[model samples]
Target: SWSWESYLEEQKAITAPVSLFQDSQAVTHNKNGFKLGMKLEGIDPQHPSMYFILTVAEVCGYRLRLHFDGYSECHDFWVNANSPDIHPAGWFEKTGHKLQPPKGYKEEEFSWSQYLRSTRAQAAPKHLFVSQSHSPPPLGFQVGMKLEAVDRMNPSLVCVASVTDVVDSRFLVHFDNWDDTYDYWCDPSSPYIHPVGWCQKQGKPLTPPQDYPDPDNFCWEKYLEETGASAVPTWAFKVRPPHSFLVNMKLEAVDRRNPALIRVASVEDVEDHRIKIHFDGWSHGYDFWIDADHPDIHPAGWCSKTGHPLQPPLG
Candidate 1:
């Protein structure tokens, strides 16, 4: 079953413990004042710069599920209670913009005034926008702690986010792979604020971050030039270690093709900066040469330190 524990592990929520999201200092949202069956003004996402009529179909926490009056169910969308994009009914007419009707909107169902006169539906109260009477808990969030967040543009897609700023009682939450502007604020207990890994536990795919770097445009070397350092002394690193070789020695050596095997290696010959090492109880195409200090070759007990399987010399 989808759960916070499974979600955290799946999504790799190691940035912060899941418990930080429920900190006592977070904002506590009481009953959301917006009611069902209320008429309101909402802008069509496909058609920007236009107003449309929609009704509250359902209320979940501080958000509302809305469907356009004359549109198909596919066009349904979510709107935050405090979102400025939606407003009380008549806002379109009041602002002198013609309110667009849903695709299936049949004006004959009821004229605007008749619909209002017939139903007790009133405009959503402005008080739903009232400021909190009490302040939220002190934000104890630190930078780099991850949290689950609702995308401001699309609330259904929960995302990975991290604490970026903490101001007084308010803190900032930035979604993964997104810029600072897309980040948003929330009350601790706000529906938008979720414990890290909520999407994973809910069995939902979270939206990925938008901050992918353009691989083609990246020049790691060019940017490193910003340090303003250039050139190197010809003599630097010119000196080579004298040819003192290992004696009566064993080394943990890796095979190029079978790196997974850390077999015992017996030093066959040594030279300045070069050593010939052969696999124990193995030969023929397995013989190899490497620098005296090559990482593939380590002092006898190297495998023990790294937990790598060591090849037995004979047994």
Candidate 2:
């Protein structure tokens, strides 16, 4: 039964401390006066594997604010000058690497310093594939087309997910049997999807699957006998391949849009049937998922081949 005036008073009471904090740390008292265009390696708490190559979007006193990708909200992250990990962009030089200006940025004409000082700030484009056009698949996707996808939050990480539904412009995917859903829109502008084994001539070495004897529980000989030539190809053995972060596997970058056949770059376990795979060499390194219904690329109970099923996939 609080009245409008009381509600307003309560809101002010809650917000006043935040405002005070901002005021006390206003520019005049700032320690690390990070300019715009300054870059820093920021570990996203959300996606720890993906490093946010951040640029200073704004400076609010002692806080060094930055912009991150794949997020609509909370794009801005702030750090204090005293933070040990935060450093100037030039620090990368210590590691024999130079921090390049953002893509399409011209350093000679508009130096990083100048861009930072400018009043008008430009918003970085969303990951290109998220809102691009796509052509009809040469081969239509069936109910459970398996594929690899990068976890948007974690760039260096990958997972396997399955196509539950293919629509006019987007594909509905689910990770393993997780109830969550992801929508991948088609972007015709990109040339990422291609046939399997397309990279053979590209000089990239596709890693071989780790060694494991065929399972004895399943009648392997009988199944091969029954299927004849229709039996799963030798390449199928490579599916759900081993990785540093072991989990379910998925084929990545094998779609109608950028159907470039590529292997999974990385994998992470999310739940019972879902895995996240990062497509290694595609646009901004796309990420997607795969479900359990997609054919088991790994030998039956491959997880238990060594010793335990619940043990981590990685050694």
Candidate 3:
């Protein structure tokens, strides 16, 4: 019963292909009927090192179609979708390696549409920073300019350490304690930069860090938790009274008017004072100023309720 000869014969029979098996039968037929905008990938015959990552631009039917790169005019190719070498473009295979798509690839969420829309909407407008307090400094000074301002919530602390660069309406600033940097766009109507005495009256001096550590350092996290602030790595901007504050307290607009009030909302670029304050289940936008002797408050007409006079933007 333990015969290896019989087992070998049975394995060979099971492994054989059907009698009528033909690879040519799988060839796609509608040669000239291919359509545009079909995503595809193929080994680049010209550039053996790179796969031809492309999309169909024009098609007749199953035959041939043009491929164009959305960004560049030089990238154009014509090919047939049914070619034995062609295949649907998967992220893993795009890298020139044989790999399987992760499990549930079809069920995975792809929000690139929303991402592109938000990205375009956030781009800086043509004209920017009409109300800047200082004249445009050299690019060398741009990074330092953002770092000079004190943190409003903790008047005693200086949040930024350096400015990296100023390109067009956007500027980059670095944090004193973190390795991260932030980018901010300025509009003439916006006051992203602050004067020297902006946070003098808000609180005592911030204790300088003793050493540098990873972003998740206990001290930094504790500071964020205690003051309810969040830092944006891209713009070197930190929000005082974290966005979670709005959801936690559920305060009304009138209650948010107190001098010691704490409110949280989404901000533009983080380096600017433009805040979309969420209160009473509604959002109201406002700009803030910090004075030498008092905490941050909205300018008259900006805040419906009475509060401390905010530091006016310098001429």
* C-alpha lDDT score of every prediction, in listed order: 0.53, 0.35, 0.32
lDDT of 3 by residue, 28-128 (tens): 23233334444444434333223343455654323343343233534454433334334444432232333222123332332323423533322111122
After superposition, which runs of candidate 1 have C-alpha atoms over 4 Å from their true positions?
Answer: 1-30, 102-112, 129-315
Off by over 4 Å in 3: 1-140, 143-147, 151-156, 181-315
**Candidate 2, residue 71: how far the Cα is off, in Å:** 8.3
Per-residue lDDT tens digits of candidate 1, residues 29-55? 334577788777765655444557777
- Residue 223 Cα positional deviation in candidate 2, in Å, after optimal superposition: 32
Give the candidate number with the greatest lDDT: 1
Clashes of each: 7, 32, 31
Name the candidate that leads on TM-score: 1
TM-score of each model, in listed order: 0.33, 0.23, 0.23
Q: In angstroms, how far off is 236's CA in candidate 3?
A: 19
Candidate 3: how many backbone clashes?
31
Clashes of 2: 32
The alpha-carbon deviation from the true structure for residue 163 of candidate 2, after best TM-score superposition, in angstroms, is: 35
